[PDB]
């Protein structure tokens, strides 16, 4: 029957909720209460990247950290040299409604997608020397929300069709499909090993996925609204999430329940983007109020504010070296903060 | 190596020259979002003017307009609709005759009420607050047939219609009955009540009694986009 399965699911939900409560011996705040607070953090705008004609939706830093790809709704994908502000490549897009972009670890290829429902792969190192779309991945039935390359031949994506899907670029076919989420998947973040990935959807739930298996190992709840952003802590054992409820929460994998909650009575706007500093001590969050808040991840204190955008901050990225933070806004500008 | 630095500088200038041309073509084009239910008549309106998102390119007196229809997207629009916050205007198509309980139209007891809810959610969205709406009250030909026949009464699903009186600006069509005029004007007044409540001058609503085969639909959109651009230039000068 449907009721017996429903009460059985409720039984399992309460059993999980008791098992997780049995591990809540001490809060992360109590454990970190005795360490020195970070104090005021002051970051200046070193580089302002100009050239996009419409709102920026996404940006990804290259592994070298000297370069970054930005994605805008004017139909253009732009590659920038952050050390000189020089544009390395401007890629015209077939569909103007791009919502995501990704840089490969090698840096040989980049990826973009959006309302077209397609993840398009562009080669940046052609024999002719001209950037050309090299593969179009068409399986997804809803918009592309996020993408990340595991390597040059593999890339994971998330769609508004409620699902995620590993792709083999050479074949163009989905090796495996992740369909656990019930709402539009908004974001995903690969673990440093790349064995696992986390995903945030519009169901106020985050899912941990085994890439090779294609199975959801853990589900994490407690957000009041849609999860817009997600990022793994740099050790791979925890991750942070940003929601429309104007709150950020840090969720531990081994503990299977959120260690910390970052909120403030004055913040009543949703979060668009979250990133961690190289140590993981600082959590950076982009907001709909046009400002990024720097949080002390261990103590949940607002260390600093980045305030240079005139429109909603759409995306944030910290360099691989940890030297810089990039911010992209609906104001058409990307700002690099030190 | 100065050779790498001068090459990157030249590459940047070649890109900037191409981006200047792109800016002229992007800023000269007017972007439209067409929203409608399956039985609104948006598809027929699109067919007359004439992919996870469908695009139609049409021109009106030297002016290029790019129109976007959803296509393959789920029925949840809270995330995807935020992408259309820069369009010139949102052409919302509503079937006027869908006030009664019809199994064929989405199996919905009231499609007009669902259209009213959608319009109120779009008009009051924080991201769409500055975006003007061109309301297309489509299927007026069917509405006249249903109101003249009289089997299904609007007052059953819209009790206020019993006290409704057609206003002095009725401008009825040649040979139109008073009953059709009171009906369509009540339909238009339902949407105007939502738009008048929160517009605040940031965005404007342009209602139009439309039919799926009307040749005037393209000229109405041209005129609405011209009035929208005029008000946006007036606002910059503070003339309002």
């Amino acid at each position, epitope marked *: 029957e449907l009721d017996q399965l429903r009460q059985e699911a409720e039984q399992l939900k309460n059993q999980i909720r008791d098992a997780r409560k049995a591990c809540a011996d001490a809060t992360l705040s109590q454990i970190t209460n005795n360490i020195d607070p970070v104090g005021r953090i002051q970051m200046r705008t070193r580089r302002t990247l100009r050239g996009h004609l419409a709102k920026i939706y996404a940006m990804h830093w290259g592994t070298d950290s000297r370069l970054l790809v930005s994605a805008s709704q004017d139909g253009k994908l732009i590659i920038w040299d952050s050390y000189t502000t020089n544009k390395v490549h401007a890629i015209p897009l077939r569909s103007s409604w791009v919502m995501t972009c990704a840089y490969a670890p090698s840096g040989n290829y980049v990826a973009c997608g959006g309302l077209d429902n397609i993840c398009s792969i562009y080669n940046l190192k052609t024999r002719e020397g001209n950037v050309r779309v090299s593969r179009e991945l068409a399986g997804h039935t809803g918009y592309l929300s996020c993408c990340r390359f595991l390597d040059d031949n593999q890339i994971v994506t998330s769609s508004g069709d*409620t699902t995620c899907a590993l792709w083999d670029i050479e074949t163009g076919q989905q090796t495996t499909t992740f369909t656990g989420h019930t709402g539009d998947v908004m974001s995903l973040s690969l673990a440093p090993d790349t064995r696992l990935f986390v995903s945030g959807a519009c169901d106020a739930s985050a899912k941990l996925w085994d890439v090779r298996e294609g199975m959801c190992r853990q589900t994490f709840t407690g957000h*009041e609204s849609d999860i817009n952003a997600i990022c793994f802590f740099p050790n791979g054992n925890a991750f942070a999430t940003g929601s429309d409820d104007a709150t950020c929460r840090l969720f531990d994998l081994r503990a299977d329940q959120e260690l910390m909650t970052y909120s403030h009575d004055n913040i009543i706007c949703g979060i668009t983007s979250v990133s961690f500093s190289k140590s993981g001590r600082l959590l950076l969050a982009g907001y709909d109020d046009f400002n990024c808040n720097v949080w002390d991840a261990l103590k949940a204190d607002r260390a600093g504010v980045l305030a240079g955008h005139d429109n909603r901050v759409s995306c944030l990225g910290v360099t691989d070296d940890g030297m810089a933070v990039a911010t992209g806004s609906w104001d058409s500008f990307l700002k690099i903060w030190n | 190596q100065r050779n790498e630095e001068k090459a990157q500088r030249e590459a940047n200038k070649k890109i900037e020259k191409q981006l200047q041309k792109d800016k002229q073509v992007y800023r000269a084009t007017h972007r439209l979002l067409l929203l409608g239910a399956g039985e609104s008549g948006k598809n027929t309106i699109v067919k007359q003017m004439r992919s996870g998102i469908f695009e139609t390119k049409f021109q009106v007196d030297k002016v290029n307009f790019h129109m976007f229809d959803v296509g393959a997207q789920r029925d*949840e629009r809270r995330k995807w609709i935020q992408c259309f916050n820069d369009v010139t205007a949102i052409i919302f198509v509503v079937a006027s005759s869908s006030y009664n309980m019809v*199994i064929r139209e989405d199996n919905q007891t009231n499609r007009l009420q669902a259209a009213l809810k959608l319009f109120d959610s779009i008009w*009051n969205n924080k991201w769409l607050r500055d975006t003007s709406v061109i309301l297309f009250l489509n299927k007026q030909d069917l509405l006249a047939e249903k109101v003249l026949a009289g089997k299904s009464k609007i007052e*059953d699903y819209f009790p206020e219609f019993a006290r409704y009186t057609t206003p002095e600006d009725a401008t009825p069509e040649p040979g139109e009955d008073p009953r059709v005029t009171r009906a369509k004007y009540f339909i238009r007044d339902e949407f105007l009540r939502i738009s008048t409540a929160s517009g605040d001058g940031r965005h404007y609503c342009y209602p139009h009694f439309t039919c799926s085969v009307d040749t005037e639909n393209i000229r109405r959109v041209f005129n609405d986009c011209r009035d929208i651009i005029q008000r946006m230039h007036l606002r910059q000068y503070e003339l309002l």
Partner: nanobody, 126 residues
Framework: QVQLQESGGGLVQPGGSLRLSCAAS????????MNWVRQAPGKGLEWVSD????????SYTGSVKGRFTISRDNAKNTLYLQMNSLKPEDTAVYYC?????????????????????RGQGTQVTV
């Protein structure tokens, strides 16, 4: 975890009266506009009523106006629908539905199939 559980639905005679209750947990109830939606058999989900966060702004569908009352208690985290003068057309599964985001004037997707922030529903028969 966001949870909405409806109750109070059952079989009534034509002209009878029911009172549906929705208990809410896992979110700040006061920050969200609440809605009652219904799915009649063989038909799609239809919006019935909405209440603002304070309870000051209230709307109803035309078919149920003057027969249905929507109320919310912020302290109890409870949403209520009082249905009077019930008719056979009012036979449906009733689902209390929260608006997606808090503090927002707009409310989108509450009547959409597979909406996350919606309870399992309570069937009402006349």
């Amino acid at each position: 975890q966001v949870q909405l559980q409806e109750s109070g639905g059952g079989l009534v005679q034509p002209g009878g009266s029911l009172r549906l209750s929705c208990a809410a947990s896992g979110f700040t109830f006061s920050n969200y506009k609440m809605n009652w939606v219904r799915q009649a058999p063989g038909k799609g989900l239809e919006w019935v009523s909405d209440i603002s966060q304070s309870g000051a702004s209230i709307s109803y569908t035309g078919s149920v106006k003057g027969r249905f009352t929507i109320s919310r208690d912020n302290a109890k985290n409870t949403l209520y629908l009082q249905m009077n003068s019930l008719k056979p057309e009012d036979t449906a599964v009733y689902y209390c539905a929260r608006c997606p985001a808090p503090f927002t004037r707009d409310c989108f997707d509450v009547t959409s199939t597979t909406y996350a922030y919606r309870g399992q529903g309570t069937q009402v028969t006349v």
